[PDB]
Amino acid sequence: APQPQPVLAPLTPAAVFLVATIDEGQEATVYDALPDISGLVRAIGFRDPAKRLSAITSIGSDAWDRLFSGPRPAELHPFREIDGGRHHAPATPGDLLFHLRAESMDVCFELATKLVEAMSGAITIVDETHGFRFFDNRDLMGFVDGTENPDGNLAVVATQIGDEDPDFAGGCYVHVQKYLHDMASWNSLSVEEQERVIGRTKLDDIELDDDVKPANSHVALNVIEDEDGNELKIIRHNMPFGEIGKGEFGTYYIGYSRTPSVTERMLDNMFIGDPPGNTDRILDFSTAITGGLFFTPTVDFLDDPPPLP
Amino acid sequence: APQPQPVLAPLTPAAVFLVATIDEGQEATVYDALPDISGLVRAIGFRDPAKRLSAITSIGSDAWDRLFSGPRPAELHPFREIDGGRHHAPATPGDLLFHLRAESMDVCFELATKLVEAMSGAITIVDETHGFRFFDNRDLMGFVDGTENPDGNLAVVATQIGDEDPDFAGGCYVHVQKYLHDMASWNSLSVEEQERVIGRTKLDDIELDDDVKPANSHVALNVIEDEDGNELKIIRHNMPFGEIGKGEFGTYYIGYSRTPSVTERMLDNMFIGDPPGNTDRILDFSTAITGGLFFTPTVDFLDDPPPLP
Amino acid sequence: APQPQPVLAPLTPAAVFLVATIDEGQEATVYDALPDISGLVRAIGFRDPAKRLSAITSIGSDAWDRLFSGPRPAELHPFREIDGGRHHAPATPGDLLFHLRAESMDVCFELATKLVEAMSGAITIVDETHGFRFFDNRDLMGFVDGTENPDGNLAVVATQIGDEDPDFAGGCYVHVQKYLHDMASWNSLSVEEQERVIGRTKLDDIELDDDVKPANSHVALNVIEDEDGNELKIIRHNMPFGEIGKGEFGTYYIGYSRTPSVTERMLDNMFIGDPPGNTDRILDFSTAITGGLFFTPTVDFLDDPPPLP
Amino acid sequence: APQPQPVLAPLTPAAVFLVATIDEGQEATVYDALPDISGLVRAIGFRDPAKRLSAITSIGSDAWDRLFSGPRPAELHPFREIDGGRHHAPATPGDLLFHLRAESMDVCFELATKLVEAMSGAITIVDETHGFRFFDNRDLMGFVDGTENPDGNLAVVATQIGDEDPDFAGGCYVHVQKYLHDMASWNSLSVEEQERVIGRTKLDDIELDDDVKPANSHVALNVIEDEDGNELKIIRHNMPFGEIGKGEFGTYYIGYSRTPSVTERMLDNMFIGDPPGNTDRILDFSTAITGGLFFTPTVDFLDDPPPLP
Amino acid sequence: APQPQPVLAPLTPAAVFLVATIDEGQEATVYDALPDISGLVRAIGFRDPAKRLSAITSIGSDAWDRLFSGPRPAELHPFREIDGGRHHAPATPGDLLFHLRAESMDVCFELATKLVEAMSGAITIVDETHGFRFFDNRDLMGFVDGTENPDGNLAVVATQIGDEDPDFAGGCYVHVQKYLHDMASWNSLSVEEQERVIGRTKLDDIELDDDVKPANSHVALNVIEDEDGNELKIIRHNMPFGEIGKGEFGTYYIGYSRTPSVTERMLDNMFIGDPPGNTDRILDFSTAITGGLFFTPTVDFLDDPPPLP
């Protein structure tokens, strides 16, 4: 009966990520537009319903204490800035996240055009990326991106909250991280060195052998084993973006998870690293620019918001 | 375990609606063809299975008392002709409704060709429309049509009968209404006047503001609030048709619902109107030509029909 | 919670069937690659995820007694060679079956390239067919092939094992039969004679009338009635193959079922035939070349194999 | 025998416009990359040849006097900045124009990535727009854009230079103009007022009646009659761009023509206006930001450049 | 007025190559079927005309002296077997070549089925390959294949014979070479070594720098400069094939050219090699299995064959 937000969707060829911070004293203006979002999605994306326009509304901690009364999600907190040994993962202020995805750029652009002008003057858009998609789902590093997202049962228990928090049954936690990795050192790097970086191959994306794969690789550090033996997986819709006029080539990481402890332990395996391997090899090239922790509610939660405190 | 008929399907670019009345004393001839319909669908539509040929067999009240013994659907009755103040909603006799939908016209045409000639001589086809589909799901009025159909849970409880009638768990009620609205007055009418008619915009189909939207608009009158606060929604596959040789430009309305009280209250909000607003603004231009109330059974019900009385 | 293998998938325009026998003393080499198969599928098919690359790993009886300890599937046995009156259904040795299916030939070819070279030297590929797909899902006989596969509930209870064997809840049994039917006698045969062979029409694939359809037709002999009145259905992904350089025109039959008693009774209705009709009319033209009985496990069963005996 | 650059191509769903100015003393570095451009196009766009990756190299006046010796195109000059009565058409310095167009964003992005890093350090990219494409070829104004481009003979004599300049037989002249029109006043404007602005309708893009169409409309001012009676047409690939984080909604105008006198007379009919109508109605909303006049050579001219002076 | 055979066609996702030798005394039987080929192409490929079924009939030297009277093509000769220093290029007997290409495998298979059974008993099919196509036009080596085929004027003068032989104005010469390159040594070879082999990159197929590219690379040896300065190009539709049951992974090379001196000088640059570089680096891995020189006539030449001698 709790219908979740469309996070369990395939990767789309175009995507728009919008991190907008809410201005002071403009609570009820966003409280108007928050039930209107699914109406705008069904209004716009029904023009070409075979484009699969799907918005993912997400709300941070500050926007939760401002906008909503009653309960609170249990692990919803501001994104812990990870000041590691060499690489730092910053956290810019962002109240709400609009994650838009469809088959083409225009319908995402029009949904975002109608989104901020349903709450005109209430928000300033802090982060504006138009994430496109490479040839066979690659990123700018050249490796195929996101091939280990689960499906079915191993995905709905990976993302959707059950009754471990029954007031928010259904719903995820989001970690956006806008990277801006350089290509000057990455392109001069050779391919087998880059496969030591990633942990899988580049052309065919075969995972490497367990003894051949180094301990500080990305696919080596991001896999998380529990003590019972089950592995915890997240679903990430990482879409590359970039502007050649500034020479920017970045991959907008965005990870959906049942609890932010899993994503934060992955980020601890990357930035803080393992106690053997204290650095992740992709962070030698990728520097995070933005960061934020958010919460997806159900679409019923946007349909029936709790009253404004 | 009751598999419903494929009503929960997206809008297809071509559609064929058949309202055929059963001749006198030809009961067992249709009783032969009624289990054969899903076999014909799987037979024809498997040629190009990425055309999604899907028939929706529907049965009226007279064909229920003739064809089937045992129980009866609780609210199945002949379509109440709504003789309002100015606009009248007539009800031509039609026993069964064949609703066909697929990606192209030809496979719907061939399924309909095999449908009446599986029961040859038993029926006369009263109403023959070949509903095509406009650019971005528009109708002949120019507005995008059917953008507020629900999905998922809010659709299956909107259409499929639970155990409030347990002998027909799964199954809908159909209201066909073949409109023949004129374009001479509609085209000379200006756009903003037409947005007062509809209640949403024309180009981008944004719903208007609640104070800006007039009370006699279509989207204003057709949304139904209950006393608990939930809204009752129906699913409609309205497909435009037309013949320019007669100058006909019509939209074949067809609405699927869990109970005909909801659709009939929508028709009462349109023709009879609200006690404040006694006329719906689209009925100034749209005159209904046909009308009928039908019942979708399950496909198991066509597989296992009750014995012929 | 048991996730089955992707057998409930639509027919794809290209398919690769691999019947590879395991060499002596190479048990642990295949035991390495058997958890790696879903990883290779998610690795390769994520390049163009709208190609739907889906492998179906299947294991015969000999490979079960060699590879796996613990329990055994209840009806898993070597494929009983049917030496009928005139037509014989042979059974070549084959340990495991790799059934690959996607929208194009190349990604199936690359998955098969990575499959045998994940277990290099451990297997010899006995049977190598590249099954393509005709115009509207036809076969080389000219008839539309596989139009009576069930969907939904009538398919999951047709294929997936419940708790009648609770140690293998979810999982099917496979009957491959590589036919090599001649076209010289079939093409000189007239159309209506061929519709007596099949039991359905050729151009539009309408099923024939029950009195018009002969008793020795294919669609007449292969439908199985039980004593309670329900019919037992299987799901078959029959893909045509062929080599004109040898003049070969064959249809690689492959049938998935909940229990091999159903498929074996269909084969008894074909080769042994009915006690009235002892021959199936398509076996006058189709001679089986290969044969094998296999078992699909769950993908969890490949993820968590029982320990190697 | 002179093969022109691919200007006679249909409008593509994604486009990248690059206006890069050449740094001082970096002439031979661009002289290396200028024959390499068609090689890079055939190298990258052959991956998915059904994406139609097509670059249009264009060279301004300064880059012509720097890069090329020998002759000069007859009307090639710096873009005359039109300081009208109210609206001004500026001209930023830009040496060369890279016009990229294909079915998707990624292959244009990769061609542009390889374009500046074939001449690394020689150029600074002044203008960086990623032009996407709306629903039915619309722009951000909502009107269908570019429906009056000619085809066939009326297009090749509209764009390609014959032997009126025989040293550059084949080749066009380009007028880029990056507009940044506001949507706050345009959206509050009503639709029939906007049809007075454009001169055609908005939903169906029917051209208005000749008496109904005002004299200061866009389609009224931009059609140019000669004294013999023929009309001079240009081909424009106007692609919308925009950034909602700055609130930018612009249409990157780019017009290809046989001679810049035609495009400049169109710009004089817009900014300077007619002596009756001195303002074009779309310039009330559209303010030009950039501007430049360039020259397309043949691809043979890039294959065989004249020697560097 | 001479319409050439459809050699100037894009690379198709499926292809069938058929090298059939004509039996002794079966001249008039092939002389019947040779005008019937374009009729069979228009007959079969018009079913789905958006599959682009296109046959390329080719005739060797022996079939020319047997089948046709009158003139002879000037350079038509049996394929000179190149017995180099280490690699040998053999030449199996093959009279005619049937090159079939379309969007899918089935219509090529059906055209080939109707081709040999229009001349039943007159031919034996010596070579039977079903060439499929990799992800982004790659081959089994992993490199993108055929990205330097010309287009337009530089292609029609590269392939079609003018009036240097006016009796066969229009028409090409074909060099088929079925390679069977091993993957065991190629896969263990590293990427940059393979880019020394090819001469271009692997992932993005950028051509290497002229000083970085070695002299014995494939792209280094196969480009042919003339003494006037123009380069002679051929058009090749190289399609990969293979059978994993034998472990075969081959690329069916097929090259169309205006004169076989160009293709033979390319083969001399490969097998015999340059006098500096006597071996081509891809021939370390690729061993030719078959070989043949053929002649494409015009389709008018098949429509109006010269009388049988």
Ligand code: HEM
């Ligand atoms: C710096 C930007 C990043 C890039 C370019 C990147 C790219 C990739 C690539 C290419 C892979 C291998 C293919 C696949 O399995 O997805 C991968 C794996 C993965 N990435 Fe990332 N990634 C980035 C950051 C992150 C972050 C910040 C997280 C989570 C905190 C993350 C989570 C994962 C996980 C969980 C896997 C799969 C590990 C396994 O297969 O179980 N990535 N990433």
Ligand code: HEM
């Ligand atoms: C006269 C022919 C009709 C036309 C041309 C028409 C067209 C439209 C259009 C353009 C909309 C707005 C877009 C959308 O929300 O669907 C709409 C809304 C709707 N129509 Fe109709 N309609 C017609 C008759 C009917 C009838 C007879 C019914 C039911 C008895 C009906 C039920 C609805 C409902 C329920 C809505 C949506 C209200 C809301 O959004 O909740 N319509 N129709």
Ligand code: HEM
């Ligand atoms: C000799 C090669 C075979 C060919 C060419 C072939 C082809 C066909 C065709 C054309 C049909 C009718 C269309 C459709 O309903 O699928 C059909 C029906 C069927 N075939 Fe086959 N078939 C072959 C062998 C088999 C085998 C070996 C089995 C199972 C043991 C089998 C099981 C069935 C079943 C169950 C049906 C449907 C009967 C009904 O509709 O309920 N077939 N086959």
Ligand code: HEM
């Ligand atoms: C300010 C940005 C501009 C926008 C949004 C715009 C948009 C449009 C639209 C919507 C049309 C009508 C549909 C069609 O015929 O193309 C049109 C027509 C046209 N535009 Fe533009 N345009 C712009 C600027 C320009 C400029 C700067 C030129 C050339 C100097 C130009 C040349 C034309 C021409 C020649 C026509 C067609 C007139 C006729 O049909 O013969 N436009 N434009």
Ligand code: HEM
């Ligand atoms: C052994 C099997 C062969 C393979 C796998 C192969 C593959 C390739 C590849 C990957 C390229 C680079 C991409 C492209 O430019 O096409 C290439 C280039 C080329 N190949 Fe082949 N090739 C083979 C044999 C041949 C033969 C036998 C000929 C002609 C006699 C030939 C003629 C060419 C030419 C002319 C080029 C382009 C050189 C230039 O760019 O101007 N190839 N081949």
